[PDB]
Design a protein around this ligand. Structure first.
Ligand SMILES: *[C@@H]1O[C@H](CO)[C@@H](O)[C@H](O)[C@H]1NC(C)=O
Ligand SMILES: *[C@@H]1O[C@H](CO)[C@@H](O)[C@H](O)[C@H]1NC(C)=O
Ligand SMILES: *[C@@H]1O[C@H](CO)[C@@H](O)[C@H](O)[C@H]1NC(C)=O
Ligand SMILES: *[C@@H]1O[C@H](CO)[C@@H](O)[C@H](O)[C@H]1NC(C)=O
Ligand SMILES: [Ca+2]
Ligand SMILES: [Ca+2]
Ligand SMILES: [Ca+2]
Ligand SMILES: [Ca+2]
Ligand SMILES: [Y+3]
Ligand SMILES: [Y+3]
Ligand SMILES: [Y+3]
Ligand SMILES: [Y+3]
Ligand SMILES: [Y+3]
Lengths: 389, 389, 389, 389
């Protein structure tokens, strides 16, 4: 086996409903299954397999450990995975390491697993390469050291990963780690609009550039947009200029007055958002997703723009389709690529959280849309889960 | 690994009971298992493995999602599989894709998975090659685009698949797709009697010809019989002439007056029926199954004719044995071949549906009969399932 | 991979308790497991793996299908397996074929699976090679065609298998099938004392000879002893002369008066008995097992003799150790060999049946003893199962 | 594949929390899982996999077999394993052999499994190489022959194992076994302070030397410290001189007056302790763990000293971090090494026993800490298990 590189995307001009992983369709009291209580799912693929990752509360449904599953950080939280297609139950899952913030990616040769745990003021990112724990990175702003919640990205053996640290309501200057065979070989300090960046969804724009659509939880409903040149190891961040603001909450499309760099209103709070590249010979496609509600984590719409510069383009993103109706939960979303024999398949995954408050269990299904064929997006996704059962 | 081709069948002059997959033997309230609620099972084999496929309602027994399991189409329906031999439970199964109509086949190098989902009036057939979503095909008659419910058929890398679209009670003109490494490279418009063809059970008559025994749900109890030439990529459909009408419902054997092409009576309604080839040096054997009841989906009998032309032969099919008695349910049936070291084993599988109406769960077992040795077919298959438990 | 052959046995002079497979330790109502209800377990090893085989009633514990589990023949009975070491549950097991009498063996390249089902008066032996059903053999005495209930024996690709047919209370003249790559290539008609022979436990004495210790269910408590020359394909049978009669029921040791060939008393009824070879350079060891009780299926003792001729030697077998106490069930026993890097390890497995009558479930654990090291057999095996739970 | 050897340890100056295996998070009555009841867990790694071993009472939670799970020795006890990461349930686990004292290790080519069973006064150690039972060793002091409860240690094909035998309250003179491909090829009689040594946690100090930190259950709270030279096959035992006494129970640090060899007080009783090597070019790190309580099996601290001689060094061990708080159970602890591509990762595993006395179930979680990165140990480990559920 050799190092993997991003290839030209497979043919197609539209996404379609691919797969639903809804493990709590089997968590009824009347049932005999043990789906794990999880959140922050993401997917990462290598040359033969895709892995469905999530962070678990180390508790199952049905079970006696529902209390505390709405929180994110605790000493029980672990990064888990199944082969994509398998239901993430107790027995099907594999536990990688203790983590309440994760990431993972395959470099052509081996899996890299990323897991942050530790106290709020001094958290720790841990790196696992296959079975071995290989490196760590330390909290630098002493306020919840955090990572992508989606796949990291490997090229020629070098895997790039966004980390962040800082107040959820204030400054969180992200950084990028260059990781090779489980070990950090460079720290990359981005320049530009670095005020607040977290939960970057990153992918390859080419063999030269990794691009991320990120979350600003404090200041803007515009997504910070990272451009990382992997040849010079330099990163730059500016807000997406598009009137189609991708964060939730958000104000009305186009209502933020001023040039591209204006913040301005409804900026506090946020959501991780899906983003994936369609690489063609002389054209680049950028696919994004955002909730159907402006304020709530309800529904999910898929958007697209071809070519241009996301930093300077005020033009609206074209609405491609409704992946999750307004009646269904649409929480975190993420991008990932499936590796076909000769080309790469861009896909958007959606976390669809089962939320009934703190007095009951709190977990998530995963819906997957992929680029396939031509036409328009045809069907939405439902979890089918009644939380009373 | 290289492309696969049909071969001479293994020696044998009779089918025998091979294996029952009855997952609901373990779905009691008093038990601790989670057999999936499924229907439309089928089996497809490659050079080392046979996968048992089905369409699931994403629901288990015991469980609290029985309502809507008598229906076929919904947003939750998925194409699943296990290694043949394994019980298709929640954990054992793998979820390939959302689909309420399915098919799959191995081409010698990789699995092609087929799955139709979407709305009634604009459904979508989706193709997966291994892990990658690779192609789609669109609804052409806008009335439930549908596919085989059994294995597609690959030769030298080219996999042929029957798709149909149109009214269940009127016109459904089927088409064939030629699929290579997950992408459609040719549409094949059949000629002849094309009024209504669905749920074709296809198989290789030789390296030149694919033949299918299909379902007319509207006009006839004779099965439409496809002959696809894979070298010229041309298909032709005519009704089976035999007096031994294979559909359910059906009138008495030989009661349809007129020449081969006559419809005539008890044609509305239908059932997918099993069909497999026994290829010998200078002789062909065609094996078929039909319900033991003329009107109801009860029982399953195995029939055989050697040589001749199914389009013009009015001779009765030889009754070979009773695979499922009149007291046991006999729903869909399908053909498949197991790959032995140097030769191919023809098999008929039978969906035995557990039907207690819409007020309880609705699922199936799968009975398997294969060509083996000489003599006569000796034993029938029962599910052993009590639906009150 | 190449054909396998019997090798010199691994060093050792005593058997010891190796492993207990007791699945119903997890079948409590208070539990969350699904151990399968089985009987007639046996084990067969290839160059890398040992598979634990049994015949299941297609039912679990806890479950609602206990009625009929004391019977042996029914339309639900299947041959199952797990990797030795795994608990045979619903999900862990693989179902090979319908069978109420079984056998299996590895030839160096692939598994041969053997399964008899069908009606009493016309039963059918079915052969599976890997995934393909390959051959059948027909009932020749029309009264429960039957087979070993233990591993068959392969050499140079030729697998030898005992089959029998005939009354349980009168004549059952056994035959041997030579099977190659799933297909029968010779029938071997044994000569000699052929009155009644069933459930042969067979093993290699050398590269030239297969020897079996069998059950006479009608006439004698002496075990018929087969000697099959695999080079000339000839088989001979005579009763074991030893005063240590191995069948249950049986009279007192040495109480049968007359020369080697005398029957005489308590001959009706019987049990399958364990038998395995310890092959040394200039010496052979024969290991056998028999119940501790003379009349009941309670207890299991291990016995040994070196060299000599089992047909003419009246000398008592040396008692080696008590594998199962009088207080524990001791039902069927069998021989098998584990494949070490350069040598073979002889082992005796014991079926320990949980018998509460017909009004409850009826299944079995498996105890394994193997040759290992020097000294004397040290510890007995209990199932630890309380049938009320 | 070729024989494995200890290598330079991976870069790192601190241990961090790596992974919790807490199978009883799933054993609620309201739950649908079957975690095995186990104790004495330990981990051993080969070049591609780590296996998490334990000794089971052949019982699950929930279950009806809780009575007797506080004891150690019985006829049901077995050595089991899962891939490290997987929850050790009835279905996930594999049963290696009957054993109420265990060990295991990988030699670069195959797994060696060690398991002691038998009666108190004549126990038997059993060796399994892959699937084959290969050798045994006999009781020499006739009072509970016993082994490591942690991984044995292989170099160039030779695997070294500590065995002991004798009163738990008096003399237990340990021996070492040199095991090659599952067969004992040398007995090694240690010299020196040999009064009482058991449950050695062993590791490679270098390619020349294996060092062990052991338990004296009778005379001292100092750990007997073995140094085995693998080239000459000689062993020597002396008590650890450090004032930081590692056993539990124990008096205050440095309260044992006298030279290094002095016993003196609170010596009766004890606990197996963790111990692993950090091998660097011209420096050795020795990592140890002891309970946080002096008297009770509560908490677990990690300690470290670099260089020097454990036999003569009276200096306090540096407190590195608190892996398990005083409020959480801290029972047996053990050392193991994970194999990275070019170096070895030292790790400490901690058995966290759920103890509610003999009137309920008795089992354990496993906490893992590994060397990763720089700084200081950051977070403790809780089981999260409520034993009423
Ligand atoms: C990226 O680089 C590799 C070789 O370095 C090449 O094979 C591949 O086609 C390139 N990817 C794109 C998108 O051009
Ligand atoms: C089909 O063709 C392949 C080569 O093209 C050949 O090996 C095979 O035997 C042929 N099949 C039949 C049924 O003759
Ligand atoms: C049996 O035959 C093969 C060669 O045919 C040989 O390698 C093996 O050692 C022989 N077995 C015995 C028991 O001598
Ligand atoms: C131990 O020995 C082997 C070769 O004998 C060598 O490859 C390895 O690096 C040595 N280990 C250490 C720790 O020096
Ligand atoms: Ca925001
Ligand atoms: Ca019809
Ligand atoms: Ca008898
Ligand atoms: Ca002590
Ligand atoms: Y959060
Ligand atoms: Y339908
Ligand atoms: Y019987
Ligand atoms: Y103990
Ligand atoms: Y399971």
């Amino acid at each position: 086996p050799e190092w993997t590189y991003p290839r030209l995307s497979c043919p197609g001009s539209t996404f379609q409903k691919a797969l639903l992983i809804s493990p709590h369709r089997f968590g009824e009291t009347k049932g005999n299954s043990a789906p794990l209580i999880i959140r922050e799912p993401f997917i990462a693929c290598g040359p033969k397999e895709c892995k469905h990752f999530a962070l678990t509360h180390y508790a199952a449904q049905p079970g006696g450990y529902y209390n505390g599953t709405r929180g994110d950080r605790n000493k029980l939280r672990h990064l888990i995975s199944v082969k994509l297609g398998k239901i993430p139950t107790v027995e099907n899952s594999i536990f990688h390491m203790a983590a309440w913030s994760g990431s993972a990616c395959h470099d052509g040769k081996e899996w890299t697993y990323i897991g942050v745990d530790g106290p709020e003021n001094n958290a720790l990112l841990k790196i696992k390469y296959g079975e071995a724990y290989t490196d760590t990175y330390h909290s630098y702003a002493n306020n919840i050291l955090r990572t992508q919640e989606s796949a990291c990205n490997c090229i020629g053996g070098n895997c790039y990963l966004m980390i962040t640290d800082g107040s959820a309501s204030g400054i969180s200057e992200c950084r990028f780690l260059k990781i090779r065979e489980g070990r950090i070989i460079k720290e990359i300090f981005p320049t530009g609009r670095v005020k607040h960046t977290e939960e970057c969804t990153c992918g390859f724009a080419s063999n030269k550039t990794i691009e991320c659509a990120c979350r600003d939880n404090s200041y803007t409903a515009k997504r910070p947009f990272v451009k990382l040149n992997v040849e010079t190891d330099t990163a730059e961040i500016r807000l997406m200029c598009t009137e189609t603001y991708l964060d939730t909450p958000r104000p009305d499309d186009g209502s933020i007055t001023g040039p591209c760099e204006s913040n301005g209103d409804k900026g506090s709070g946020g959501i991780k958002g899906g983003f994936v590249h369609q690489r063609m010979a002389s054209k680049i496609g950028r696919w994004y997703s955002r909730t159907m509600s402006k304020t709530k984590r309800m529904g999910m719409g898929l958007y697209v723009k071809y070519d241009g510069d996301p930093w300077t383009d005020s033009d609206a993103l074209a609405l491609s389709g409704v992946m999750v109706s307004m009646e269904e939960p649409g929480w975190y979303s993420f991008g990932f690529e499936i590796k076909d024999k000769k080309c790469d398949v861009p896909c958007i995954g959606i976390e669809m959280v089962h939320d009934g408050g703190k007095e009951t269990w709190h977990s998530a299904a995963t819906a997957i849309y992929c680029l396939m064929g031509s036409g328009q997006l045809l069907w939405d996704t439902v979890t089918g889960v009644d939380m009373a059962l």
